[PDB]
Enzyme design. Structure first.
Site, PDB file in Angstrom:
ATOM      1  N   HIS A  72       0.875  -1.286   0.440  1.00 12.67           N
ATOM      2  CA  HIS A  72       0.103  -0.014  -0.154  1.00 12.67           C
ATOM      3  C   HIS A  72       0.880   1.052   0.066  1.00 12.67           C
ATOM      4  CE1 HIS A  72       0.147   0.475   4.381  1.00 12.67           C
ATOM      5  NE2 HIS A  72       0.127   1.702   3.986  1.00 12.67           N
ATOM      6  N   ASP A 113      -0.475  -7.029   2.734  1.00 13.86           N
ATOM      7  CA  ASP A 113       0.117  -5.983   2.017  1.00 13.86           C
ATOM      8  C   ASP A 113       1.898  -5.715   2.243  1.00 13.86           C
ATOM      9  OD1 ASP A 113       0.162  -3.186   1.927  1.00 13.86           O
ATOM     10  OD2 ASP A 113      -0.781  -3.049   3.989  1.00 13.86           O
ATOM     11  N   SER A 150       4.099   2.067   8.657  1.00  9.63           N
ATOM     12  CA  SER A 150       3.143   1.257   7.633  1.00  9.63           C
ATOM     13  C   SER A 150       4.870   0.496   6.848  1.00  9.63           C
ATOM     14  CB  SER A 150       2.439   1.439   6.410  1.00  9.63           C
ATOM     15  OG  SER A 150       1.091   1.783   6.333  1.00  9.63           O
ATOM     16  N   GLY A 151       5.304  -0.107   6.860  1.00 15.82           N
ATOM     17  CA  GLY A 151       6.157  -0.912   5.601  1.00 15.82           C
ATOM     18  C   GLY A 151       7.547  -1.331   6.895  1.00 15.82           C
TER      19      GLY A 151
END
Lengths: 218, 4, 218, 218, 4, 4
Positions: free
Chosen positions: D41, D88, D173-174
């Site tokens: 994402h 994801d 995120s990530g």
């Protein structure tokens, strides 16, 4: 509940807490000795056989002898639509019957099709988030709200606290909206975050499901 | 809308 | 608007307030004496025949003799896509023509296809939420923003306040983004909450709809 | 990260920052000298050829001689589903190979199919939002979290900070979730806002993608 | 994205 | 759910 007040202990004996560990996640209403009513979305992606139904509670952080704990035996859904958030109501059959007493009692429902207009004064309640400061509440909270149409769908009962930022929050779903002593709503969703001061809170309109409920209940 |  | 300042009274005479009771819910821009431009999502699930279009306002909590109130007669949409949030623009025809004066004037639009690059300095404005403390603003707020591409779609004009948490919020939708004295955007959506300090704010790119607007307007 | 602490400088040499200007937007993990792993994402609607991969960073607001900057040459996706938020995870091949040193090192992955049960203690980390006060963090933050099943999907690894409001936020995120010294998660999504105190944080379960990763990596 |  |  954001901007509310502690309820008097056992003031609302039909109030239920749905828990996963010993962690509250949604409210519910006792509608019969062996059935509770909540929001469909509360049980949608949850391990139902792991849910504990807590009756006669006030302070969740305390050991309370007044409590009665049940498991879920069956689920009855109506047409829950997770995209549109319509029909956000579920009936859960208990693995037993509650012991009715001063602390655990059944709620009174409205007649089928009864609709509330703008201005009706009601009380919302729950153990949900207190704001973004304060996680879930330990003690049941209650809040005076007003029914409003306007920024609301015909398929919901919406409420708003005029002139201050207050409303239902995460964890309040499934909790009753009591108007004139009857259960008129089931807390379903918020918009713009909890207590926007814009966007009314949305409840599933119990009056529209009375025929269905009865069909199961009695 | 966020389901509560 | 979060982190902005009160506008000088009647500094932006093309600024409009869309109301449901006497409650502001979205802004708009006067584009002709009998037409206002707003965000499509503002009128999507609203009772249009109940909307009041308020011209020449500054302080919404005050009685202001400068005001002109109109109803909506017709709606003109372009290809509003609620899933993707594309074409978030609507033209509303008034049930009359505004009285042009010092306090109510028509806005100037850009030429068709004019695109803004990174770094253009513009002003956003609105009566939306002031933060999560403070509901809707009483007095019009304005805010200096910078155009940015980057974390933005080609189908939007995005803005960001560098080095502080500031931006548009709920209630600001439909309000103009003014760059070099022309209406270049219509407030459409936020990401990560209002004034993330990450995620630029998104506006409908008015320059891309000029041909369409004219076709209706004149 | 909300409610965490500054990490000791260069304590986690596999930690990466993905940037667009010189603005951090997502984290990543170095998995080989020429490959980084992040959340799908993060790269979904971004101009990939504009992304800078920053290795050996600690304080993003400072000039740091320890840094190594790479571009993205290729992207490897698995079955990213943006509606359901499944799979994801993305692998990004660098336009070069990092210089391994005290400040830049490759992370250790778990074996394929290894699953974490309730109670495992792990550390989350990132340069994401600090709360809604405080934008992105300048200095890397870390946070002790506990793995929980419960309000979680089988397709994710979820975590929760018990008794206080803390968690991952936008910009995290990530970033890796490290459990028993191995990368077990990739920060993917939050529910109810960042640090709800209800809703566990969700990570992509790296153990489930090990076979795939290897197939590309080596 | 949340429409405002 | 909001992707972070």
């Amino acid at each position: 509940i954001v901007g509310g007040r502690r309820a008097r202990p056992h003031a609302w004996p039909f109030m239920v807490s749905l828990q996963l560990r010993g962690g509250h996640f949604c409210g519910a209403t006792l509608i019969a000795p062996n059935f509770v009513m909540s929001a469909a979305h509360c049980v949608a992606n949850v391990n139902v056989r792991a849910v504990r139904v807590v009756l006669g509670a006030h302070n969740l952080s305390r050991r309370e002898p007044t409590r009665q704990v049940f498991a879920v035996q069956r689920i009855f859904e109506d047409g829950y639509d997770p995209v549109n958030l319509l029909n956000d109501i579920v009936i859960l059959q208990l693995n037993g019957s509650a012991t009715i007493n001063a602390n655990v009692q059944v709620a009174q429902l409205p007649a089928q099709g009864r609709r509330l207009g703008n201005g009706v004064q009601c009380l919302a309640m729950g153990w949900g988030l207190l704001g973004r400061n304060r996680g879930i509440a330990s003690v049941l909270q209650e809040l005076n709200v007003t029914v409003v149409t306007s920024l609301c769908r015909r398929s919901n009962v919406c409420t708003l606290v005029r002139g201050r930022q207050a409303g239902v929050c995460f964890g309040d779903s499934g909790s009753p909206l009591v108007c004139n002593g009857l259960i008129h709503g089931i807390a379903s969703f918020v918009r713009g975050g909890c207590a926007s001061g814009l966007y009314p809170d949305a409840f599933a309109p119990v009056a529209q499901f009375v025929n269905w409920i009865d069909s199961i209940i009695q | 809308a966020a389901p509560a």
